[PDB]
Design a protein around this ligand. Structure first.
Ligand code: CLA
Ligand code: CLA
Ligand code: CLA
Ligand code: CLA
Ligand code: CLA
Ligand code: CLA
Ligand code: CLA
Ligand code: CLA
Ligand SMILES: CCCCCCCCCCCCCCCCCCCC(=O)O[C@H](COC(=O)CCCCCCCCCCCCCC)COP(=O)(O)OCCN
Ligand SMILES: CC1=C(C/C=C(\C)CCC[C@H](C)CCC[C@H](C)CCCC(C)C)C(=O)c2ccccc2C1=O
Ligand code: SF4
Ligand code: SF4
Ligand code: SF4
Lengths: 740, 41, 80, 165, 124, 143, 73, 35
């Protein structure tokens, strides 16, 4: 049944459509007459659901666009490896990773910007990078710049192959709709080969290449004296005296004596004291177990050989008594609607990015990663923001699916229909819990600020006056600290040092130490829960009320992206689901800004710092237990106590950060009149400017118009988010580089 | 070719070409005349 | 209630009535246009002021005009 | 000595700023071996700083109480005190280039409005015509004032769209 | 229109039925008395728990009890304001004007009684 | 139309479960709107107050709290199946008023029977300035 | 620096004046809204027709000029 | 002339508690009054 279905040469590879910009849609096919057309040309460019009603052509376009994005990502990765190969001090950093800062960007001396090439150490000048590529290459066994050059060349070759694949699988051999709709085959192949085989290949690379190089690096020998990875691969003597179980030569794997592999497949939890990172043997056994689990999971769905489960049968069988038709029409929804799959993928990918940020601030899975505070902070913040953007786009594309691809004929008494049927109760209860959370968190903060300003330190909700200690979090921390003691007896230590235990430090700087949770921690965690709850409320109100409401009963006919329904019914501005996503973008920005502020203050006060003979001296001296309970404490002891490096960065290599900082503030301001104002004022101003250009006979043939209301909202939210993210990026990086 | 030439005749491509030309001219002027502020010879 | 006013520049294209989401407009016989139709608003108390009729008007400026003021239960679009 | 500003050559704080910049450049330079690329880059930066500080002097530049040079603004005062090239001549050059750009754009608009569908020519540029007008704008002020003289520069208000009163 | 097992359970209906607000037939003053007693008794607690003088022995209870009684007085005033604003014009007698006024009088009487009961219960 | 149809509350409702965007307390205090149609066959449609319902083969009656919901359902049925429905308005005292097909031929047509009201016999922009009508209660567009 | 901030003040004054006189001169009519006198001084918009007409009244021009005046002061 | 020492102890409670309460009660009766 499952087979390859490909049409041969449906689209001719010609440049005749490159001359005409607007060609994918009939509205833009007539040519431009106003300036908004140009914006429309850059707005509906990749809205393939609007260009054609045929699902096969949309699927082919999606396949080729994914190939193009993979080629772009591979070009970027090859550029990263090339920058590490030539304009970097990676070889110098490998000798002493605790004293030379990682740098991989070198500027050209043109107008005095050569001061940005700071003294990172190792006889090199450049920009101190915070991406952690040095630690990743050290974890991968990369020693010389020749390996980075070869990786860059291979990445460029693979990017060219991906671009050729996109061109080929669109223009030459375009897969049919039946090829894309084989969801069982897609899931089986992705679970077995895309994830399981990739995990097995990375585990094999770790076992045969990364583990011996990392062991010799931790032993303290010179990187040039380390044998090349192929010497470990071919001649078994070096890997045999580095790991005695390799002397057996694949015997314990087939004889089921896997315990003999315990030397290089370990379960020693915690961090390696030599480098302050996760044990490479632990990661090797981890990726091996992941590969085995995904290989098992990839043989679940029936494709062509009788055995295996059916997704439609599984969905139709799971029907409870309180839900009517249990998961009935969802199989037809997710095999016909690209936007529902996009919503699911974006939600899970954003959540996965959040887990990634949390679980690599917690366990640094890279050698000399925790010592670089700036790298850890930048990675956490970056993965955080990518996850937040992806989970906003999840609600956006779910609302798009609800507007466009929803069919009431296939959804009568299923789960989606019942969710629509009690959306008002859902939104009302979510609104109530959002209000309650906002009151009992932010009002607690305001209460602390007032009773601090009223001279009542005993009336605060602090760690000394009224202890609202996180008893559940503390109990979970104590249980996970005792996880290797009773419930995981084969683990040598705890899975992380955040629960408790000793302090792991590398090079005199704290790699990882136990994190204490107090009243301020409970306050900020409940604040984060409140902000996430409000963002969920906004996005769910956008999704569920995208089709109709009591206010507007024909909102589905207006489309997903419309500005308003006029000033009727008192006014219906920002009533669309797109406007709901536009509003929720700011709430996501506020939520993740508070989250990363809590992260930065918490690691700067209670985790990061230096280790002396007397004890651990943190960066901010542990003020989070006493200053994070008030908004004034966040203003003074976090925003004013820090950010002094950003404003004093002038005349140093960090000055561009401060420059970016100021520019970021500018962009954050420049968005506001796109967020405020309207369109009629700018249209009349443009009319006056048109009169001025008509007096001098320099009026353009293309009529200039003001930006659309949806376009103005999009420009405002984009510039606002860019300004805020760049402000936090510049402030965080300058503060964590100057004193970190 | 003429389809490709009209593609390069589009506004973003000629804008990119103008931006590259102007940026290169200003950068080479500032490099070969380091820090110009006062119009003197 | 809001005020809906229709002028003689209407061409009787029936676009304002089709765009009306509350059945406020109507077409009456006329002699001032080629189509022999003229828009009328006999149910202006049910109008909310959404200005959907003005969006569908093909003539330059507007042959139909909605003026807000004196909001009621029906004009505010309230289901409660 | 106008506006209570000392010349940069005879100034005091100008020398303090120069020594401070040379001192921090030498402090950065001493951390590298002489036979290294960062050493050469820092030496080039120090040479550029010294050349900039020398060229800012012996050019009539004035600085007041901070060593940072000040620009004399009023023409006539700038003309009689050797400060015309500070802002009087740069605005003349900028006016020349800005009028070049405006005249080239005006010529392109006028020549592109003649043919059918001028918006296509606006959004898909005629590169040979644009380059021909680019190299024909070296005498923009003469042409501009002559179109002003013959009235083709201005449009009559009867033919210009006017907002209702 | 969307009935739920939560909103249509017999146990939920019986629990809502015997409440003073939804009682079958009871004079509105008795409903107000029960409402004031229960709500003042629960309101006295947070006022004596974490008041401004919670650390002072003896003063905490009396300060919280008078705070609860004052809050009961403001609640009765707002109840009378709602009764005058909503039922100024013209079959349940509680929703009537004088019925709601008697309900407000019973509410303040019951609130004062509940505050006094909380005082004499926390004193022993 | 030729004879105005009368509302029949005994006509069966379409197959639908519970509703949340349905009738509020305004229905029992103020007017509420009722849409009736004559489905030739059993088919599934989408209500403007929630999810999806199935209309019965024969007379179908639905209740809404707003006239906009009634006209949205009317135009959905007319565009999807060419149903030609009609809705009434029922007040608190039970007064039934016929709303959508006032002459029975829909407002897109003319029928040569309606009288044009609220029409200005001057062009737009020929209205007097607001200074001309001051302290009189008459708007420039109302004359 | 005093001259630069004075020129910035001149920018603020000129821009606030530009907003206010654009609101005042186009108060009774414009190309987008010829009949703005019939809609009074403070009306929200004309709806999404003709491309979008939000913040077209002179009151909204004043309300933007309040932001600009706040920035200038 | 000179107010007594308990004047701040008395006058601020009225204008802070019972004067806004009386004004709000009167205004709330004013809004909802029908003919
Ligand atoms: C300018 C107006 C104004 C004034 C004069 C006050 C005065 C007061 N408020 Mg404040 N308050 C105000 C506005 C004002 N408030 C506003 C606008 C807010 C909201 C932002 C608050 C929020 C607020 C909180 C959250 C709290 C106060 C409290 C207090 C008291 C301070 C502590 C004290 O003296 O305990 C004196 C305590 C006594 C018991 C002495 C008697 C005074 C009582 C409270 C008034 C009479 C009670 C009432 C009428 C019922 C009594 C019936 C019967 C027994 C006669 C004091 C009575 C605290 C308080 O009263 O604790 C509960 C408190 O916790 N206020
Ligand atoms: C085990 C086989 C296998 C493997 C490994 C993949 C791998 C992939 N698929 Mg695919 N898929 C498969 C079978 C497989 N597929 C089958 C059988 C079907 C039909 C039911 C599909 C249908 C399908 C769709 C519809 C889409 C994908 C996409 C993707 C990419 C996901 C993005 C990612 O994780 O980046 C990982 C990236 C890398 C590891 C970089 C290297 C990528 C190399 C060049 C690919 C090598 C694997 C390839 C399948 C080998 C056979 C190709 C051969 C003829 C040359 C990834 C490259 C998405 C896509 O288009 O991405 C471009 C997408 O939208 N898959
Ligand atoms: C994808 C992951 C991966 C890869 C590539 C390897 C590869 C290797 N490991 Mg490793 N290993 C892995 C995972 C992996 N292992 C895992 C998960 C474990 C468990 C912990 C181990 C444990 C382990 C141990 C303990 C040892 C190895 C050893 C080896 C080597 C022996 C090869 C062998 O016998 O395999 C079987 C390989 C083949 C049968 C070859 C494939 C067939 C060829 C390619 C056919 C070519 C035909 C062609 C068309 C015709 C010629 C073409 C020409 C004309 C151009 C080899 C370098 C041993 C070693 O280093 O000693 C040398 C050793 O001691 N490994
Ligand atoms: C920091 C700025 C800020 C603040 C405080 C608010 C506050 C609010 N917005 Mg908003 N929001 C903002 C900016 C802000 N907004 C911006 C710029 C946007 C544009 C994207 C939005 C978008 C937005 C959406 C889309 C939604 C909200 C919602 C909310 C509510 C949050 C829910 C809650 O628990 O509130 C509680 C109230 C507060 C936190 C305000 C401070 C309360 C303090 C502690 C005073 C406590 C009471 C006080 C003592 C009484 C005073 C007495 C006095 C009268 C005498 C609340 C009314 C949501 C809503 O309606 O409710 C869920 C909602 O859905 N907002
Ligand atoms: C805040 C939530 C939270 C988090 C993040 C953790 C995290 C952890 N705990 Mg802890 N735990 C928690 C709450 C939590 N715990 C509460 C209790 C009290 C009951 C415990 C009791 C506890 C003990 C006793 C132990 C841990 C241990 C651990 C570790 C491994 C656990 C593991 O294998 O999970 C599973 C790991 C996965 C990756 C599975 C993820 C599967 C994904 C999310 C899909 C799941 C879908 C699901 C199957 C479908 C739902 C089915 C449902 C309808 C029936 C890890 C550090 C162990 C330890 O010490 O560390 C070594 C240990 O011994 N925990
Ligand atoms: C409108 C702007 C403006 C302003 C405020 C000034 C201001 C000044 N000019 Mg200038 N000037 C200007 C434009 C301006 N100039 C222009 C456009 C020209 C033509 C190029 C001149 C040509 C000029 C000459 C030739 C002289 C001045 C001089 C002066 C100074 C004294 C003027 C006076 O009446 O005594 C004073 C600083 C005189 C001077 O140097 O002061 C000592 C002087 O000799 N000006
Ligand atoms: C690093 C140098 C630099 C840079 C980047 C700029 C950048 C800018 N200048 Mg500035 N300027 C500079 C130096 C600089 N200036 C100097 C040194 C002077 C002399 C003191 C001026 C004097 C100046 C004026 C007088 C004007 C600008 C304008 C502009 C802006 C738009 C130019 C334009 O429309 O394109 C190029 C020009 C066109 C496409 C159209 C041609 C219009 C020009 C200005 C007319 C030239 C001929 C005219 C008849 C001469 C009399 C001018 C009149 C004001 C008296 C732009 C942001 C203009 C502006 O901001 O307008 C809002 C403007 O009016 N500049
Ligand atoms: C070359 C074409 C051209 C010409 C001759 C003018 C001329 C004029 N404009 Mg206009 N303008 C233009 C393009 C042009 N503009 C474009 C593309 C925009 C959109 C950004 C504007 C936006 C604009 C505004 C918002 C305003 C003016 C104003 C003015 C007047 C002041 C002079 C000046 O420099 O303003 C400054 C002009 C600018 C800063 C715009 C510069 C835009 C780019 C950088 C220049 C484009 C050059 C073009 C690509 C060359 C094409 C050559 C061809 C061979 C390809 C003057 C009548 C002002 C006015 O009404 O004064 C009475 C005013 O408020 N213009
Ligand atoms: C009309 C403008 C007339 C300017 C006359 C300047 C005469 C003096 C002169 O040529 O000496 C300087 C030499 O600058 C030079 O490099 C020559 C500039 C030539 C100016 C006339 C063209 C110019 O003045 P400066 O360079 O000392 O002025 C300060 C910078 N703005
Ligand atoms: C300012 C503003 C405008 C006016 C702005 C418009 C029409 C967009 C202008 C875009 C310009 C043309 C982008 C390019 C700017 C420069 C010419 C490009 C850089 C030039 C240098 C490289 C030389 C709106 O139309 C609008 C609409 C809806 C809500 C808010 C607003 C709003 O705030
Ligand atoms: S949309 Fe305009 S022109 Fe058309 S029938 Fe209505 S009022 Fe007349
Ligand atoms: S504003 Fe809307 S409801 Fe009113 S007459 Fe126009 S289209 Fe109909
Ligand atoms: S035109 Fe603008 S202000 Fe008016 S309803 Fe639409 S979005 Fe709102």
């Amino acid at each position: 049944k499952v087979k390859i279905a490909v049409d041969r040469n449906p689209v001719e590879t010609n440049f005749e459509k490159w001359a005409k910009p607007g060609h994918f849609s009939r509205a833009l096919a007539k040519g431009p007459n106003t300036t908004t057309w140009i914006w429309n040309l850059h707005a509906d460019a990749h809205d393939f659901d609007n260009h054609t009603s045929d699902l096969e052509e949309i699927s082919r376009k999606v396949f080729s666009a994914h190939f193009g994005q993979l080629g772009i990502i591979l070009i970027w990765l090859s550029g990263m490896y090339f920058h590490g190969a030539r304009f970097s001090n990676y070889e110098g950093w490998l000798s002493d990773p605790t004293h030379i800062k990682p740098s991989a960007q070198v500027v050209w001396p043109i107008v005095g910007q050569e001061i940005l090439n700071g003294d990172v150490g190792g006889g090199f000048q450049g920009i101190q990078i915070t991406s952690g590529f040095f630690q990743l290459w050290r974890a991968s066994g990369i020693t010389s710049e020749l390996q980075l050059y070869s990786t860059a060349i291979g990445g460029l070759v693979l990017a060219a192959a991906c671009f050729f694949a996109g061109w080929f699988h669109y223009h030459k051999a375009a897969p049919k709709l039946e090829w894309f709709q084989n969801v069982e085959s897609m899931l089986n192949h992705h679970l077995a080969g895309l994830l399981g085989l990739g995990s097995l290949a990375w585990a094999g690379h770790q076992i045969h290449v990364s583990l011996p190089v990392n062991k010799l690096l931790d032993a303290g020998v010179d990187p040039k004296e380390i044998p090349l990875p192929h010497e470990f691969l071919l001649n078994q003597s070096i890997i045999a005296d580095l790991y005695p179980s390799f002397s057996k030569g694949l015997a314990p794997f087939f004889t089921l004596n896997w315990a003999e592999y315990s030397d290089f497949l370990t379960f020693k939890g915690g961090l390696n004291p030599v480098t302050g990172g996760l044990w490479l043997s632990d990661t090797a056994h981890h990726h091996l177990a992941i590969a085995v689990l995904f290989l098992v999971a990839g043989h679940q769905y029936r494709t062509n050989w009788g055995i295996g489960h059916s997704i439609k049968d599984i969905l139709e069988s799971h029907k409870g008594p309180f839900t009517g038709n249990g998961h009935a029409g969802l199989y037809e929804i997710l095999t016909t609607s690209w936007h529902a799959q996009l919503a699911i993928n974006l939600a899970l990918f954003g959540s996965l990015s959040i887990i990634v940020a949390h679980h690599m601030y917690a366990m640094p899975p890279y050698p000399y990663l925790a010592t670089d505070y700036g790298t850890q902070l930048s990675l956490f913040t970056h993965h955080m923001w990518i996850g937040g953007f992806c989970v906003v786009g999840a609600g956006a594309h779910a609302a798009i699916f609800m507007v466009r691809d929803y069919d009431p004929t296939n959804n009568y008494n299923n789960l989606l229909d019942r969710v629509i049927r009690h959306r008002d109760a859902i939104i009302s209860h979510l609104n109530w819990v959002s209000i309650f959370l906002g009151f009992h968190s932010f009002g607690l903060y305001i209460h602390n600020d007032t009773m601090s300003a009223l001279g009542r330190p005993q009336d605060m909700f602090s760690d000394t006056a009224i202890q609202l200690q996180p008893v559940f979090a503390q109990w979970i921390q104590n249980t996970h600290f005792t996880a290797p003691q009773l419930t995981a007896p084969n683990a040598l230590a705890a899975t992380s040092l955040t629960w408790g235990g000793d302090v792991v430090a590398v090079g005199g700087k704290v790699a990882m130490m136990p994190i204490a949770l107090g009243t301020s921690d409970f306050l900020v965690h409940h604040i984060h829960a409140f902000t996430i709850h409000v963002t969920v409320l906004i996005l769910l109100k956008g999704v569920l009320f995208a089709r109709s409401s009591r206010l507007i009963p024909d909102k589905a006919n207006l489309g997903f992206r419309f500005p308003c329904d006029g000033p009727g019914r008192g006014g219906t501005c920002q009533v669309s689901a797109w406007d709901h996503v536009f509003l929720g973008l700011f709430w996501m920005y506020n939520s993740l800004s508070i989250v990363i502020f809590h992260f930065s203050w918490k690691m700067q006060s209670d985790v990061w710092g230096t280790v002396t003979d007397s004890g651990v001296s943190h960066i901010t001296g542990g003020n989070f237990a006493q200053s994070a309970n008030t908004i004034n404490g966040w203003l003074r002891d976090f925003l004013w106590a820090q950010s002094s490096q950003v404003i004093q960065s002038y005349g140093s290599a960090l000055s561009a950060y401060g420059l970016m900082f100021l520019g970021a503030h500018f962009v954050w301001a420049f968005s506001l009149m796109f967020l405020f104002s309207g369109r009629g004022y700018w249209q009349e101003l443009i009319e006056s400017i048109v009169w001025a250009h008509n007096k001098l006979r320099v009026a353009p043939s293309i009529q200039p118009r003001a930006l659309s209301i949806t376009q103005g909202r999009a420009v405002g939210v984009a510039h606002y988010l860019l300004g805020g993210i760049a402000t936090t990026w510049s402030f965080f990086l300058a503060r964590i580089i100057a004193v970190g | 070719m003429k389809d490709f030439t009209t593609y390069l005749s589009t506004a973003p491509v000629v804008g990119l070409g103008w931006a590259i030309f102007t940026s290169g001219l200003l950068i080479e002027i500032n490099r070969f005349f380091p820090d110009p502020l006062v119009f003197s010879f | 209630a809001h005020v809906v006013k229709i002028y003689d520049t209407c061409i009787g294209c029936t676009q304002c009535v089709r765009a009306c989401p509350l059945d406020v407009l109507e077409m009456v016989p006329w002699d001032g246009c080629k189509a022999a139709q003229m828009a009328s608003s006999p149910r202006t108390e049910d109008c909310v002021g959404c200005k959907r009729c003005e969006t569908a008007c093909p003539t330059d400026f507007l042959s139909v005009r909605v003026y807000l003021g004196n909001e009621s239960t029906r004009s505010l679009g309230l289901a409660y | 000595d106008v506006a209570g500003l000392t010349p940069c050559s005879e100034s005091k704080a100008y020398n303090k700023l120069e020594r401070k910049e040379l001192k921090t450049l030498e402090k950065r330079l001493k951390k590298y071996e002489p036979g290294s690329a960062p050493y050469l880059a820092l030496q080039a930066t120090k040479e550029r700083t010294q050349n900039r500080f020398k060229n800012y002097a012996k050019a009539g530049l004035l600085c007041g109480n901070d060593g940072l040079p000040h620009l004399i603004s009023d023409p006539g005062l700038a003309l009689r005190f050797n400060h015309a090239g500070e802002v009087f001549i740069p605005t003349f050059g900028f006016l020349y280039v800005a009028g070049y750009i405006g005249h080239v754009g005006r010529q392109y608009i006028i020549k592109s409005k003649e043919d059918a569908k001028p918006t296509d020519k606006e959004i898909i540029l005629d590169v040979p015509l644009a380059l021909q007008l680019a190299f024909q704008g070296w005498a923009w002020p003469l042409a501009a004032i002559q179109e002003l003289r013959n009235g083709s520069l201005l449009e009559k208000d009867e033919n210009i769209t006017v907002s209702p009163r | 229109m969307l009935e739920t097992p939560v909103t249509s359970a017999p146990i939920v209906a019986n629990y809502l039925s015997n409440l003073p607000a939804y009682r079958t037939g009871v004079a509105p003053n008795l409903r107000g008395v029960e409402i004031g007693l229960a709500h003042g008794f629960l309101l006295a607690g947070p006022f004596i728990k974490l008041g401004p003088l919670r650390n002072v022995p003896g003063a905490a209870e009396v300060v919280g009890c008078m705070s609860a009684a004052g809050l009961v007085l403001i609640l009765a005033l707002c109840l009378s304001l709602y009764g005058n604003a909503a039922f100024q014009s013209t079959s349940d007698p509680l929703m009537s004007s004088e019925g709601w006024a008697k309900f407000a009088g019973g509410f303040t009487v019951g609130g004062l009684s509940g505050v006094a009961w909380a005082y004499v219960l926390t004193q022993v | 139309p030729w004879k105005q149809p009368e509302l029949d509350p005994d006509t069966p409702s379409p197959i639908f479960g519970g509703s949340t965007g349905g009738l509020l307390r305004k229905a029992q205090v103020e007017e509420f709107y009722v849409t009736t149609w004559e489905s030739p066959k059993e088919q599934i449609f989408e209500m403007p107050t929630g999810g999806a319902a199935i209309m019965r083969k024969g007379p179908n009656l639905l209740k809404f709290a707003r006239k906009e919901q009634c006209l949205a359902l009317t135009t959905q049925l007319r565009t999807k199946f060419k149903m030609t429905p009609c809705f009434y308005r029922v007040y608190a005292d039970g007064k039934v008023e016929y709303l959508h097909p006032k002459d029975g031929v829909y407002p897109e047509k003319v029928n040569a029977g309606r009288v044009g009201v609220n029409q200005n016999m001057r062009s737009i922009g020929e209205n007097v300035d607001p200074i001309k009508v001051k302290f009189t209660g008459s708007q420039p567009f109302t004359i | 620096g005093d001259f630069l901030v004075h020129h910035a003040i001149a920018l603020g004054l000129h821009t606030t004046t530009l907003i206010l006189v654009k609101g005042a001169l186009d108060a009774r009519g414009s190309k987008l809204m010829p009949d703005k006198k019939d809609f009074g001084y403070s009306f929200p918009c004309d709806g999404p027709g003709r491309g979008g007409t939000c913040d077209i009244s002179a009151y909204d021009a004043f309300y933007l000029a309040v932001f600009w005046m706040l920035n200038t002061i | 002339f000179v107010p007594p020492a308990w004047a701040p102890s008395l006058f601020v409670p009225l204008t802070g508690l019972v004067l806004p309460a009386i004004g709000m009660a009167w205004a709330f009766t004013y809004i909802q009054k029908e003919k």
